[PDB]
């Protein structure tokens, strides 16, 4: 009863999934998942990485990975443009699916995938790995327990500078048709996954966006950048509470600055993913000792004890994916719900596309 | 020497008194003459005139402003009294150092702006967060192209002085007698910093909330009418984007005026709770690439007048000594003071525009 | 042709070694090591953890694991008092050894193990995993490149609070005979491993030490704490350069505070393991922009690109052990020297034991 | 009945004292001290700075300032080699003395000054201004209240880089005869003032020291730096508790890094003067919220409310000196004892000179 695993793609997220599947039973116990099929192109790369990743075989044929009888679950980590075709084929073949974010390039493709997931009766989860840190999970539990009273404001950002260099060449990812959203698709969807986990569903957005580098080098000429480098939005949650939201792929000096804070009637929680082992908690205290606490990640926080019994031994980015794999393992076993599945993921896609629509039309966008 | 009248002795009154006393110590020239202190009641004016070193105390602010030995008036009274006192001081031909915000309404600020122009006297408003060496260094770095072209501003001003729901109701929490809430107490400060970094505001879209809607009032409750918190998206006259917020109920924050300017070639970041640090990112070789912590010292504007050695932390109160020197130099015709009542009216239009936007659910253009 | 692995112990370090062996080829390439035998007591635990760790078999007899013909390298993660017996048996059986720190309870035992390692033509490495972070390795390279000129001062500390609470029960680890050193053995050896890597060898120490909680709950009575809760030393390096050194197991609020700085003639480097992804570098700059740089760990630093292509995705404590495994793998393949081996480890044992002696006699101890 | 003030020197500390005397009554109430005589050289500089500082007159003659009948108290902010002559003259003239640190160049000098202060029956205070921050004073009160349980370790450092540049010229401050100690005299004495205020008296030190830049430019040539650029020491307190101690004037990137922590059996306090408005306090808490608190300086802390009613409005370095002035003012009025006076200051001189002796001889020094 070991879970049979297929992996499609071996890049940033492909290798991250491979490391997660390899150690999920080391951390959490039970039977090690069997690493059956690795799909990647070209074939010589799939063969080489299948060998070093410990997959029983590599193939250049992604459909082989979704249709092998020894496969129960498929990790899909290919470019956004391929997610709908590969996820639907995996569900149609009766496989559980771990799909990297975002779901697809459009709300329409995500809607089709959401319907296909319901029809398949298989488990799905989307790769929102910033919801998996012990610090983030600890913050959600502290809010649930009334540690900061009633939330009254959310402020969140996700700054990186991977596109700040204007000489970085044009690519398909910078077109609407083949790339979908820009910073909202690469980073915004992550901040939404964290924001709605803390504050509940979004009822309304009003957004602005900018393209800072509007044209890029392309084969001796230049081509237009058609999606946003940065976006900001004001939020009304279904609770009526306010929010501030931003993302940027051109924010110089920032590498993984997913940073958020929840202000409540009885305290404040604050976090920055660049220091993912620290959670700042303010609660009213006597005047002589009053102030924010630095909570350093350790075994009191969800998931941490599976990796290390001693506090302050920093939890890493890649271990978030081991926690994500375990949540999908337990969901497949009927011992837990995985979040977000394709239904909860579709809502996230509607929010980021709603922000893009609001920025273009200059109108607030309402949900439900 | 400049003859000084001071009206009020509270948070800002005592801050102005300390500033007028040491402005020549820091910057040279003749010490201003501390001529008349006005406060109520008379006993308190006489007591604080003695300890603050003013030649006399009065309970009559009107005769304080009319005194021929007075050249300049510090006005540190509640918001509702700013218009009457500033107009009376300008009418008596005195220069005016007025605390923020200008008044309760744009209408009031417009009348004050007209009176200031008609008086041919110098005015400055108490936007003291524009006076830190770190802030002034950041403006100079942007002017030198240290971060290329600004592409985004993000600013906040969080405090928690009204977070306790048991704090009593006051006339400050009514629209008619209090004006704006967090936008008037804190928002105006963040605007003074934001437009100094990014230039004028073209458009705002705002949201606001009253978080604690009823407070204790005489064994009963009374309704809070103005906002505890407000947020806005900004479009600058330059076409650049901004994020803006303020709050008087943000638990754990005491003076968190924090801002960030992201440019095409770097980033500047600041937090007033650590007012001696300026964070600068510029691209560097990969082995050493990262933000620099610039600790305030004599390389930054104003610091060397207070201390010859870097890392000896500059204080909130010393911002007011810099503010006094800027007014002194304006009065001597050796510098232009910012913001005067004309510059100040623009800031009033922005915070009232944010309030209007939050009420209507519509953007406001300037 | 893949390395055959035996693992003895399954605790804090046992599980850390198991996760390292499982992902070393995922991160760095080549053939995944074969997880052949896991040894632990009792046998039921050995069989259970062999299953979840992915070892081919579990045994309650460690001697039988180190003699297995399918085993080439032995990870020893057992308590300090068993290190000598198990390392000597593994070397005698012709196996390479990955030994957890400290080497043993006494210099006498470390001396015997060092002679054994040498008598064998097998590779050894000791688990000084704080020398493996990208930030630390980056700092060593910056010093060698002259980024801070000549070191003029070292200041290092290693504070934790795992024994700070007077309520915490007595254990055999708090006796000289069965526990060996206190804070110097648990934490001090780690700080020495980092300090001599930055500054070069120790020539002289003058030390103080204290047992600050002298008795602890034991069987409804109390028992005496015999070894040190904290120790501090002034250092002279062979270079002539000065140092400050401390460790503590009773330092309230600290969880993994291995923190050090190197002050040089042309700059300063500063590091804190509780924020293991930040390296602080000061070099003189023009007055308007002069200040320390926060270098955030990313692919420019040694080892990081094997785990993640994007900077600011925090490297974790456990990933230090994957780097350590790779260094031992490459040393076994004859394509790099592993540090520290049992010879370099014996020097570290002599330094911490010299500090303990200096504190006891009130006299400096010389090593050269 | 206003206190009459003489100020000797107008440099870093002279101007800091001038600003403190000017606003001490503004902050704390009572009668503003009268700024009577400022002494500095040359005369035109004394006249110009007396005018801008608000002193009734300037003179080039420090003895004129000390002897003026309108003067009750003398601020002495001159170089270390002049402290003894000027302090003894002020005490002999019947004036209270606010003396900058360190007291003098030698223990022998400090002993003579300590005797002169007792004979004069005048108040003395030494300018250990880092003991005056609201954060420091709050930490001392928290330790006394048992907030960290029993102290078990002190670790303190004081790093600056004002001499890190080898091209900074030689001065008489860098000879032992005319300059006394190096980093131990400039910074070490400050760290001792904070350390003994937290941990009580020092019983034993073992120290090491180095001169990193042994020769400096002198009038186109070179001259020898005779005193230490950095020093480190292990401490035993009279309590039996351990300490670590260091100072440096060549620690690149540090500007005012007086940083200390006290570890106790029920908590830890930690502070860094470069962020002088933050005090870090760890006390045990339930595991879900356990961690250090950032205490931001505000009106709950000693002295702060005299300057500002609102927390988080950063208290400045210069306002430490306004607090120091107030402590001396109250001591003169018989309404409080000022610390350290020349008797408590002599003990601090013995500790820093004992560290220098320990570093020179390679032997521990007992007190
Ligand atoms: N959760 C997270 O933090 C992160 C998620 N991602 C997501 O990972 C996904 C991939 O990222 P990208 O930058 O687009 O590319 P990438 O190069 O990082 O990975 C794409 C992988 O898919 C393989 N591939 C491409 N076409 C294929 C085909 N037809 N059959 C089999 N394999 C194929 C490539 O060879 C490569 O191994 C995206 O959905 C992206 O949004 C990326 C970075 C971080
Ligand atoms: N720039 C800044 O950072 C700050 C500015 N302020 C501003 O300062 C002004 C006053 O607020 P605070 O100083 O906090 O209030 P406060 O209550 O501390 O001081 C008000 C002073 O005005 C006096 N006063 C009232 N009515 C008077 C009258 N008819 N004649 C003479 N004196 C009178 C009061 O007795 C008191 O001394 C406000 O406009 C406020 O917005 C306040 C705090 C900080
Ligand atoms: N490098 C580092 O960062 C760290 C190193 N260590 C070191 O790791 C070693 C073990 O400490 P922990 O892992 O914390 O202890 P632990 O109690 O968590 O693990 C000890 C393991 O050895 C096993 N064991 C004991 N006797 C055995 C026997 N006769 N045969 C087979 N297995 C046996 C135990 O069942 C247990 O699995 C120590 O040498 C310690 O100094 C510990 C923590 C961190
Ligand atoms: N407590 C603190 O934080 C600080 C204390 N200090 C102390 O302040 C004192 C002065 O500092 P330095 O660096 O030596 O010099 P400095 O140049 O900062 O100040 C010396 C002042 O004394 C004046 N002076 C020199 N000889 C004089 C004489 N014969 N008569 C009248 N005035 C004379 C100088 O013109 C100058 O105004 C020293 O004792 C030093 O330790 C210095 C900096 C900070
Ligand atoms: O999903 C992501 O997108 C990458 C860029 O495509 C970012 O670098 C990652 O930090 C982020 O996790
Ligand atoms: O203008 C201000 O208003 C006060 C509230 O009334 C805030 O506490 C101050 O920080 C701020 O400078
Ligand atoms: O080797 C170690 O010893 C443990 C205690 O035994 C500490 O908690 C660890 O941080 C350290 O790595
Ligand atoms: O007393 C002091 O000595 C100066 C050096 O002379 C340092 O720069 C100051 O920070 C220190 O307070």
Q: How far is CA D14 from CA A303, B316, D142, D267, in A?
A: 59, 22, 33, 39
Q: Please give the distance, rounded to the nearest whole angstrom, from the Cα atom of residue C171 to the centre of ligand 3.
A: 15
Which of A166, A263, A274 should one mutate to test binding to chain B, selecting the residue with the greatest count of B CBs within 10 A? A263
Same domain, A275 and A208: yes
A311–C316 C-beta distance less than 8 A? no
Which residues are CB-neighbours of A18 under 8 A, at least 6 positions away? A7, A10, A35, A38, A49, A53, A55, A75, C26
Query: SS3 helix, strand, coil % of chain D, rounded to 5?
Result: 40, 25, 35
**CA–CA separation, B34 and B52 (whole Å):** 9
D47 inside 8 A of chain B by CB: no
What region, left, alpha or beta, does residue D336 occupy, with left being phi > 0 and alpha being psi -120 to 50 degrees? Answer: left
Q: Which domain holds residue D257?
A: 127-367
Same domain, C200 and C159: yes
B309 inside 8 A of chain C by CB: no
C288–B140 C-beta distance less than 8 A? yes
Which residues are CB-neighbours of C53 under 8 A, at least 6 positions away? A25, A26, C7, C10, C15, C18, C22, C35, C38
Please say whether the beta carbons of D151 and D262 come within 8 A: yes
DSSP string, B104-165: SSHHHHHHHHHHHHHHT--EEE--GGG-SHHHHHHHHHHHTTTT-SEEEEEEEEE--TT--T
DSSP run (H or E) holding D281: strand D278-282
Short-list C316, B330, B280, D36, CA closest to A323: C316
Strand bridging mode D34-39 / D4-8: parallel
Short-list A185, C309, A275, CA closest to A193: A185
Cα distance from B357 to chain D (closest Cα, Å)? 30
Query: Which residue from C minimizes the CA distance to B294?
Result: C291
Among the partner-chain residues A287, A293, A294, the one whose CB lies closest to the CB of D300 is A287
Q: Is D41 in the pocket of ligand 4 (CB under 6 A)?
A: yes
**CA–CA separation, A17 and A21 (whole Å):** 6
Please say whether the beta carbons of A164 and A208 come within 8 A: no
D152–C155 C-beta distance less than 8 A? no
Please say whether the beta carbons of D283 and D268 come within 8 A: no
Please say whether the beta carbons of C164 and C198 come within 8 A: no
**CA–CA separation, C33 and C31 (whole Å):** 6
Residues of C in contact with D157 (CB under 8 A): 155
A142 inside 8 A of chain D by CB: yes
Q: How far is CA B17 from CA A153, B11, B14, D113, in A?
A: 38, 10, 5, 38
Residues of C in contact with A52 (CB under 8 A): 25-26, 29-32
Please say whether the beta carbons of C101 and C131 come within 8 A: no
Q: Could you give the count of Cα atoms lying within 13 Å of C82 in the half-sphere of its Cβ?
A: 13
Chains that touch D (3 or more CB pairs under 8 A): A, B, C
**CA–CA separation, A337 and A322 (whole Å):** 16
Longest Cα–Cα distance in chain A: 66
DSSP run (H or E) holding A195: helix A189-199
Q: How far is CA B114 from CA B110, B118, B341, in A?
A: 6, 6, 9
Short-list C111, C73, C82, C142, CA closest to C327: C73
Query: Which residue from B minimizes the CA distance to D309?
Result: B11
Name the phi and psi angles at B176, rounded to 5.
-70, -45
What region, left, alpha or beta, does residue C134 occupy, with left being phi > 0 and alpha being psi -120 to 50 degrees? Answer: alpha
Bridge partners of B125?
Answer: B98
D140 inside 8 A of chain A by CB: no
Please say whether the beta carbons of A130 and A273 come within 8 A: yes
DSSP run (H or E) holding B24: helix B11-27
**CA–CA separation, B22 and D32 (whole Å):** 13
CATH number at residue D14: 3.40.50.720
Which residues are CB-neighbours of A180 under 8 A, at least 6 positions away? A80, A102, A104, A105, A106, A227
D236–C284 C-beta distance less than 8 A? no
Bridge partners of D292?
Answer: A294
Q: What is the resolution of this structure in A?
A: 1.6
Return the ligand 3 atom nearest residue C16 CA. Answer: 13
Q: Is D131 in the pocket of ligand 4 (CB under 6 A)?
A: no
DSSP run (H or E) holding B327: helix B316-331
Same domain, D25 and D78: yes
For the CA atoms of A310, A311, A317, A323, what is the dihedral angle to 10 degrees? 70
Q: Is D256 in the pocket of ligand 8 (CB under 6 A)?
A: yes
For the CA atoms of D38, D43, D49, D51, what is the dihedral angle to 10 degrees? 80
Among the partner-chain residues C12, C30, C309, the one whose CB lies closest to the CB of A52 is C30
State the DSSP code for A339: S
Q: Is D9 in the pocket of ligand 4 (CB under 6 A)?
A: yes
Instruction: Report the b/e string of D3-31 with b at 16+ CB within 10 A.
Output: bbbbbbbbeebbbbbbbbbbbbbbbbebe
Cα distance from A295 to chain D (closest Cα, Å)? 5
CA B290 to chain centre: 32
A291–D291 C-beta distance less than 8 A? no
Mutate to test the pocket of ligand 7, among C99, C160, C254 (most ligand atoms within 8 A of CB): C160
For the CA atoms of B319, B320, B324, B325, what is the dihedral angle to 10 degrees? -20
Q: Please give the distance, rounded to the nearest whole angstrom, from the Cα atom of residue D188 to the centre of ligand 4.
A: 17
Same domain, A14 and A63: yes
Query: What angle separates helix D317-332 from helix D12-28, to the nearest 10 degrees?
Result: 70
B165 inside 8 A of chain A by CB: yes
Please say whether the beta carbons of A12 and A101 come within 8 A: no
**CA–CA separation, A14 and A35 (whole Å):** 13
Strand bridging mode D57-59 / D34-39: parallel
D148–C252 C-beta distance less than 8 A? yes
Residue A334, helix vs strand vs coil:
coil
What number of other Cβ atoms are within 10 A of residue A44's Cβ? 11
**CA–CA separation, D346 and D107 (whole Å):** 7
Which residues are CB-neighbours of D57 under 8 A, at least 6 positions away? D36, D37, D38, D47, D50
**CA–CA separation, D156 and D273 (whole Å):** 11
C291–B294 C-beta distance less than 8 A? yes
Mutate to test the pocket of ligand 2, among B62, B78, B182 (most ligand atoms within 8 A of CB): B78
**CA–CA separation, C260 and C267 (whole Å):** 14
**CA–CA separation, B356 and B342 (whole Å):** 21
Q: Is D100 in the pocket of ligand 8 (CB under 6 A)?
A: no
Name the phi and psi angles at C278, rounded to 5.
-120, 130
Please say whether the beta carbons of C227 and C171 come within 8 A: no
Return the ligand 8 atom nearest residue B309 CA. Answer: 8
Bridge partners of B215?
Answer: B222
Q: Please give the distance, rounded to the nearest whole angstrom, from the Cα atom of residue A173 to the centre of ligand 1.
A: 12
Listed in sequence order, the DSSP H helices in chain D are: 12-28, 43-53, 62-67, 80-92, 107-120, 134-145, 176-179, 183, 189-199, 317-332, 342-361
**Numbers of helices and strands, H then E, in chain B:** 11, 17
Residue B271, helix vs strand vs coil:
strand
What number of other Cβ atoms are within 10 A of residue D311's Cβ? 25
For residue C291, say if its preceding peptide bond is cis, omega within 30 degrees of 0. Answer: no
**CA–CA separation, B65 and B7 (whole Å):** 9
Task: Name the strands in the sheet holding C73-76, side by side, starting at the edge strand that comes first in the sequence.
Answer: C57-59, C34-39, C4-8, C73-76, C96-99, C124-126
**CA–CA separation, C68 and A190 (whole Å):** 48
Cα distance from A328 to chain B (closest Cα, Å)? 37
Return the ligand 8 atom nearest residue D100 CA. Answer: 1
Mutate to test the pocket of ligand 3, among C78, C80, C81, C187 (most ligand atoms within 8 A of CB): C78
Same domain, D10 and D97: yes
Same domain, D137 and D50: no
**CA–CA separation, B254 and D301 (whole Å):** 14
Domain boundary among B94, B125, B156: B125
What region, left, alpha or beta, does residue A365 occupy, with left being phi > 0 and alpha being psi -120 to 50 degrees? Answer: beta
Among the partner-chain residues C147, C290, C295, the one whose CB lies closest to the CB of B294 is C290
Same domain, D361 and D282: yes
Q: Please give the distance, rounded to the nearest whole angstrom, from the Cα atom of residue C186 to the centre of ligand 7.
A: 6
What number of other Cβ atoms are within 10 A of residue C177's Cβ? 9
**CA–CA separation, A269 and C92 (whole Å):** 56
**CA–CA separation, A64 and D360 (whole Å):** 77
Which residues are CB-neighbours of B30 under 8 A, at least 6 positions away? B1, B2, B24, D51, D52
Same domain, B47 and B157: no
Please say whether the beta carbons of D199 and D154 come within 8 A: yes
Please say whether the beta carbons of D169 and D296 come within 8 A: no
Pairs of residues, one from chain B and one from chain D, whose beta carbons lie less than 8 Å apart: 135
Cα distance from B361 to chain D (closest Cα, Å)? 34
Name the phi and psi angles at C348, rounded to 5.
-60, -45
**CA–CA separation, A267 and A271 (whole Å):** 14
Strand bridging mode A34-39 / A4-8: parallel
Mutate to test the pocket of ligand 1, among A6, A7, A8, A9 (most ligand atoms within 8 A of CB): A9
Q: How far is CA D98 from CA D6, D17, D121, D346, in A?
A: 10, 9, 14, 15
Return the HEC string of A282-310: ECCCCCCCCCCEEEECCCCCCCHHHCCCC
Same domain, C30 and C162: no
Which of A288, A299, A304, A305 should one mutate to test binding to chain D, selecting the residue with the greatest count of D CBs within 10 A? A288
Q: Could you give the number of structural domains in chain A? A: 2
Query: SS3 helix, strand, coil % of chain B, rounded to 5?
Result: 40, 25, 35
CATH number at residue D211: 3.30.360.10
Residues of A in contact with B163 (CB under 8 A): 265
Chains that touch B (3 or more CB pairs under 8 A): A, C, D
Among the partner-chain residues D206, D251, D268, the one whose CB lies closest to the CB of C251 is D268
Bridge partners of C6?
Answer: C37, C74
Q: Please give the distance, rounded to the nearest whole angstrom, from the Cα atom of residue B327 to the centre of ligand 6.
A: 21
**CA–CA separation, B108 and B102 (whole Å):** 8
Among the partner-chain residues A138, A142, A292, the one whose CB lies closest to the CB of D293 is A292
DSSP run (H or E) holding C58: strand C57-59
Same domain, D173 and D121: no
Same domain, D157 and D91: no
Domain boundary among C107, C126, C145: C126
Q: Please give the distance, rounded to the nearest whole angstrom, from the Cα atom of residue A134 to the centre of ligand 8.
A: 44
**CA–CA separation, B322 and B306 (whole Å):** 10
Residues of D in contact with A138 (CB under 8 A): 288
**CA–CA separation, D160 and D96 (whole Å):** 32
Say which experimental method was used. X-ray
Query: SS3 helix, strand, coil % of chain C, rounded to 5?
Result: 40, 25, 40
Please say whether the beta carbons of B83 and B111 come within 8 A: yes
Q: How far is CA C214 from CA A98, D263, D267, in A?
A: 54, 17, 18
Please say whether the beta carbons of D129 and D324 come within 8 A: yes
Which of B139, B293, B303 should one mutate to test binding to chain C, selecting the residue with the greatest count of C CBs within 10 A? B293
Same domain, B192 and B247: yes
Domain boundary among A126, A160, A186: A126
Short-list B277, B217, A159, B283, CA closest to D314: B277
């Amino acid at each position: 009863k070991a879970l049979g695993v297929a992996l499609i793609g071996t890049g940033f997220m492909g290798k991250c999934h491979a490391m997660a599947w390899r150690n999920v039973a080391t951390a959490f116990g039970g039977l090690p998942p069997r690493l059956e099929v690795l799909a990647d192109m070209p074939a010589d790369k799939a063969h080489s990485l299948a060998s070093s990743f410990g997959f029983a075989r590599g193939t250049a044929d992604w459909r082989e990975a979704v249709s092998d009888p020894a496969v129960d679950v498929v990790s899909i980590t290919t470019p956004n443009g391929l997610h709908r075709e590969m996820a639907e084929a995996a569900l149609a073949a009766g496989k559980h699916v771990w799909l990297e974010k975002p779901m697809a390039l459009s709300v329409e493709d995500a809607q089709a995938m959401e319907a296909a997931a319901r029809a398949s009766d298989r488990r799905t989860i989307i790769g929102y790995n910033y919801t998996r840190s012990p610090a983030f999970r600890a913050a959600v539990d502290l809010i649930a327990e009334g540690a900061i009273g009633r939330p009254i404001h959310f402020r969140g950002m996700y700054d990186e500078d991977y596109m700040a260099d204007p000489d970085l060449p044009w690519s398909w990812a910078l077109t609407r048709k083949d790339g979908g959203l820009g910073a909202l698709g690469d980073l915004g969807c992550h901040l939404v996954s964290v924001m709605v986990s803390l504050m509940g569903p979004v009822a309304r957005v009003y957004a602005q966006a900018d393209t800072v580098i509007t044209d890029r080098p392309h084969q001796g000429g230049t081509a237009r950048v058609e999606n946003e480098d940065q976006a900001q939005a004001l939020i009304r949650f279904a609770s009526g509470t306010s929010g501030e939201f931003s993302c940027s792929r051109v924010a110089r000096g920032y590498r993984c600055r997913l940073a958020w804070e929840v202000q409540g009637t009885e305290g404040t929680l604050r976090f920055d993913q660049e220091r993912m082992n620290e959670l700042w908690l303010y609660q009213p205290g006597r005047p002589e000792i009053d102030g924010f606490r630095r909570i350093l990640t350790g075994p009191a926080q969800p998931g941490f004890a599976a990796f290390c019994p001693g506090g302050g031994h920093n939890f890493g980015f890649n271990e978030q994916k081991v926690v994500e794999a375990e949540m999908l393992r337990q969901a497949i076993a009927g011992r837990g719900k995985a979040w977000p599945d394709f239904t909860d993921g579709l809502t996230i896609e509607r929010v980021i596309h709603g922000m893009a629509t609001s920025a273009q039309t200059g109108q607030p966008v309402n949900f439900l």
